């Protein structure tokens, strides 16, 4: 981290002082009228924002000289509010055929507290640069866990594929999570990593680069607007999601729990790795960024949970997963597996009950 | 006026058709596709589901329904003040030079729109000159305050001539007052109309002009020094638009999210409490009267230290020194 001390912001003297230290510290080569003025702006910014009684911290991080519109168009541009208005459904929207329904739906026994960090079922905190590639990010931190789950190997997988094959999205101008795991299903895998390395600008689709690749059964959304059915869901394996990643408190996000103001327009997928609940009683979301281990909590946020239906920055809106089908599902115990229960609990698709009668009367 | 609709057209493909070829016929929308038709469908659900919550306000079904929120905020609310506020000039939170810091006998609502000193809703287009119309809002403000005559002022002459402010693609309105002060006064609109892209600084439709003694900032990040400022006259600042529920705003006190990055320009007009014990600020927008209330939103007043959308960020005024104080 940068420190710094109050009185250097009182002068000019000081704080062009400061402004050449965090430049020296960071190897930032600019060192511009313009750029001190932006560095003065966002500094007195956090300053101001620490001396409040908020839940989350802010650093002067590398962004420092950087205006949030520069920052958000070059960190955060992967449009998926606007791209999920193209070419998807509202938030909360249900299924086409009702039953497949989602996976997690009727799930009874779940931790408090789940951090897959812990359960190694998480990667290394990866950067993506200038490039709106944040929906093979998050696609991705989704697909590293539940491979690390199904097969106890943890394994990083390629943004980079997803980025220059992925032709249902719009490589670095943005897409959607969902068809990024359609794609892995119907192209018959994404490959490692190291195989399919990560470049920061879409290239051509090289097939000979694809090997060693994760095969995947499908994928589904989280019910939207529910962020308990998304508790349900992160319970049992990393989320895929977007949020609005914009404004100077996300900018400079660096310990806590952000429970600051954003809008519900997300612009940047990002994966849910955990949720808990801190000593001041906070409920979180451990989120999983693509910004380096440079910001936030070594590379994570902390955000709020449970604080609007539609989530604090739309987390809560547009979330999906790759499924790999469970090999031994469990296992509660109660009540009996009802003969008499409907495979379609509307009966429209079908009539049939999940058992048939032992007892039986001549009519 | 208003588009109504019907719960059960949601229900279908058929129906939702129905209601987007009505709603073309209806706002004069001469492109029928699949892709806006799911732009449609994307809003409307979300201003139906809106509108099914207990809220302080609704949202409507206006012009901007085929249009995502990326590329409404793009073409109507892109005067990145936030931007030019970091490039050159000071951080929110810049109380003794301030002319209203000492008033102590201030009304508890105020609506300059009945105390004939606000013109009507106007529209800027694509074009990013919401700082020339909140600059303008608070133009228009103080010399009908001061000459008791209303008249309209130009946004244009702001556009085309004030070369500290970037045009089209943004500025402060600090700068804007400056540039009044500097450049011998604003014209009034019919003598340098709008047009809504910039063009060339013709010094022969400056004519009329409204010149001013000084401006001011109000302090940042204080609603009250706002409230103080707003008594007084209407106050040009910068405010976060962006989102669905702003995008579609109808009626009410917007208590809805919002960042805090107020990169569109707006004129705060006055202020007052809902019979529901709201605190709001009136403001006026320039997106034509077909948006909010009659071009209007009352957004909410006292729930931030920025202000809600960061409304008390970057807050001024044009000084027309009082002649009886």
């Given at each position: 981290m940068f420190h710094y001390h109050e009185r250097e912001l009182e002068s000019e003297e000081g704080f062009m002082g400061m402004y050449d230290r965090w430049r020296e510290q960071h190897n930032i080569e600019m060192r511009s009228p313009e750029r001190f003025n932006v560095f003065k702006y966002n500094v007195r910014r956090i300053h101001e924002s620490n001396k409040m009684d908020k839940p989350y911290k802010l650093k002067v991080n590398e962004f420092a000289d950087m205006t949030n519109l520069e920052f958000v168009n070059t960190y955060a541009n992967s449009k998926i509010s606007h791209f999920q208005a193209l070419r998807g459904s509202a938030p909360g929207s249900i299924d086409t055929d009702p039953n497949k329904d989602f996976i997690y739906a009727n799930v009874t026994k779940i931790p408090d507290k789940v951090d897959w960090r812990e359960k190694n079922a998480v990667t290394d905190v990866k950067g993506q640069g200038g490039c709106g590639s944040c929906w093979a990010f998050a696609a991705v931190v989704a697909l590293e866990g539940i491979n690390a789950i199904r097969t106890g190997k943890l394994v990083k997988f390629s943004e980079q594929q997803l980025v220059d094959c992925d032709m249902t999205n719009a490589g670095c101008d943005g897409g959607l999570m969902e068809p990024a795991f359609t794609y892995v299903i119907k192209h018959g895998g994404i490959a490692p990593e190291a195989s399919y390395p990560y470049v920061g600008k879409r290239e051509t689709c090289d097939k000979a680069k694809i090997k060693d690749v994760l095969k995947?059964?499908?994928?589904?959304?989280?019910?939207?607007?529910?962020?308990?059915?998304?508790?349900?869901?992160?319970?049992?394996?990393?989320?895929?999601?977007?949020?609005?990643?914009?404004?100077?408190?996300?900018?400079?996000?660096?310990?806590?729990?952000?429970?600051?103001?954003?809008?519900?327009?997300?612009?940047?997928?990002?994966?849910?790795?955990?949720?808990?609940?801190?000593?001041?009683?906070?409920?979180?979301?451990?989120?999983?960024?693509?910004?380096?281990?440079?910001?936030?909590?070594?590379?994570?946020?902390?955000?709020?949970?449970?604080?609007?239906?539609?989530?604090?920055?739309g987390v809560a809106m547009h979330s999906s997963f790759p499924i790999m089908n469970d090999p031994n599902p469990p296992k509660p115990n109660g009540p009996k597996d009802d003969p008499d229960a409907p495979k379609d609990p509307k009966f429209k698709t079908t009539q049939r009950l999940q058992g048939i009668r032992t007892k039986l009367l001549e009519l």
């Open positions: 995947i059964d499908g994928r589904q959304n989280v019910p939207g607007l529910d962020e308990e059915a998304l508790r349900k869901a992160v319970a049992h394996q990393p989320v895929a999601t977007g949020i609005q990643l914009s404004g100077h408190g996300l900018q400079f996000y660096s310990e806590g729990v952000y429970t600051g103001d954003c809008g519900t327009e997300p612009n940047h997928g990002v994966g849910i790795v955990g949720y808990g609940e801190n000593e001041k009683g906070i409920k979180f979301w451990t989120v999983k960024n693509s910004w380096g281990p440079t910001w936030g909590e070594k590379g994570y946020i902390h955000l709020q949970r449970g604080a609007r239906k539609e989530g604090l920055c």
